[PDB]
Design a protein around this ligand. Sequence first.
Ligand SMILES: [Mg+2]
Ligand SMILES: [Mg+2]
Ligand SMILES: [Mg+2]
Ligand SMILES: [Mg+2]
Ligand SMILES: [Mg+2]
Ligand SMILES: [Mg+2]
Ligand SMILES: [Mg+2]
Ligand SMILES: [Mg+2]
Ligand SMILES: [Mg+2]
Ligand SMILES: [Mg+2]
Ligand SMILES: [Mg+2]
Lengths: 31, 50, 62, 107, 50, 63
Amino acid sequence: IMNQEKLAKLQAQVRIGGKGTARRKKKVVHR
Amino acid sequence: MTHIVREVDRPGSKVNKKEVVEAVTIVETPPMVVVGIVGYVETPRGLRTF
Amino acid sequence: MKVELCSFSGYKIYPGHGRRYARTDGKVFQFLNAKCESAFLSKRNPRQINWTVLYRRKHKKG
Amino acid sequence: NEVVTREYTINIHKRIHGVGFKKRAPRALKEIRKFAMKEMGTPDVRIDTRLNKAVWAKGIRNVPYRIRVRLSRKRNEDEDSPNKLYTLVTYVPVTTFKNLQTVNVDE
Amino acid sequence: QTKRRALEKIDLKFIDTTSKFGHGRFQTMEEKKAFMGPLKKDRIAKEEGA
Amino acid sequence: SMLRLQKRLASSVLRCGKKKVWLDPNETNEIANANSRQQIRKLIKDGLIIRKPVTVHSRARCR
RNA sequence: AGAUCUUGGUGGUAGUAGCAAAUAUUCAAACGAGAACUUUGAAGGCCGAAGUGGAGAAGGGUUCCAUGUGAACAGCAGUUGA
RNA sequence: UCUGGGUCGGGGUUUCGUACGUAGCAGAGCAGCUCCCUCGCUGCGAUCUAUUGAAAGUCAGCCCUCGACACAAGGGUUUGU
Ligand SMILES: [Mg+2]
Ligand SMILES: [Mg+2]
Ligand SMILES: [Mg+2]
Ligand SMILES: [Mg+2]
Ligand SMILES: [Mg+2]
Ligand SMILES: [Mg+2]
Ligand SMILES: [Mg+2]
Ligand SMILES: [Mg+2]
Ligand SMILES: [Mg+2]
Ligand SMILES: [Mg+2]
Ligand SMILES: [Mg+2]
């Protein structure tokens, strides 16, 4: 689930570029 | 530098009693402060500081 | 201190400033600077330039 | 203190005046780093990538005349380094440059 | 100094005071303001001055 | 460390040029461990490698 | 001692000429003892389909791929490389 | 030092010429709606009008601040009749 701490840092990882670039969809680790 | 307007009092000239525009130069001169005196003496080798 | 002259723009031209232009027809014009002279030579009407005095009084500015 | 941070505005146009077209933006970055070293007295100066993008926004020669930046002096105690302090410079997007003063910004 | 260029009285009539940082066209601050009247910055400053 | 092989394999699998290949700048050691196209496919599925969108060239002005 | 002698070596020149054809690179991070040049990400550019793009013939012959090295070469450097 | 010198900011000057947005029964005209309107209302529309001698730059080798900010008695190498 999402809380305020998780949301504020989520904004960082989904942005992989400046304005006009596609957002990151996922970053999943699986072994 | 700047320029001024004055009347010329030169008889026999085309510009006699006429208006002219002449460039002038502004030289700011604050008063000098005399702080010493040097005396020179004449020698056959020339002037030298006495 | 001499005779004050008016330009294309209607500005006063102090002595030692600008240029005087005499046409072949017998008319004499004087210009405050090269901008006014260039505007006049292109036959630009001073009433259509926003910073000319003639435009100011035509539009009753101020 | 020594972990102080502040906001400034820089006349980039004053410092680029005379620089050739193909060197204007790199010279602006160099002047930014030099100004940070001048103001915070720290040899280590890092420029945020957002500031780098903002300076290069209008290409290589049409550098923006003014820009608003934020200087943050921080500890470098993460490894054995000669300099214990480094200055981080970030971009402050502002609407206008009128009546802006060098202001002390808190945490 | 004996030439008529020298020993000649000089009586100034006008001195240019226009802005030499470009093609200046006004002599004093008051003349420029009187010719131009109030401006936008003057208007807003008077508004702040009640 | 040096991801030229990873970029080439990603461009091969994704069927796009090296311009569109985006590697995660954070998980460099994870991507560098990929040395097979199966591993590249798995990384693409896990979101570490993303095909960047085509540079926008609109025809609205033309229309 | 000579023969613009032959062969081999070394000077001054001289740390000199020079490393200037084809618009242009910047920021952060990673590895590394070492980063202007490697790699990644961001930005600004360029080649603008008669391309600096994608494939062949002749010709080359392993330069192809992967891993490792930093002796020598890539007229600077290189953690990179034909 | 009776502080200093910088960097911003302000003012002065200067250059170009009246910014975006808003508003207009301004505007070549055109396209829709008529219980409506009795002559109206709603769009599209270059350009114009007011805001608006406006907007923007102005030392980097322009002038003046006493507005804000921080820094400046610190470093290093030599020098003897
Ligand atoms: Mg001049
Ligand atoms: Mg011999
Ligand atoms: Mg002999
Ligand atoms: Mg010989
Ligand atoms: Mg040389
Ligand atoms: Mg050369
Ligand atoms: Mg092109
Ligand atoms: Mg090809
Ligand atoms: Mg190879
Ligand atoms: Mg070499
Ligand atoms: Mg100023």
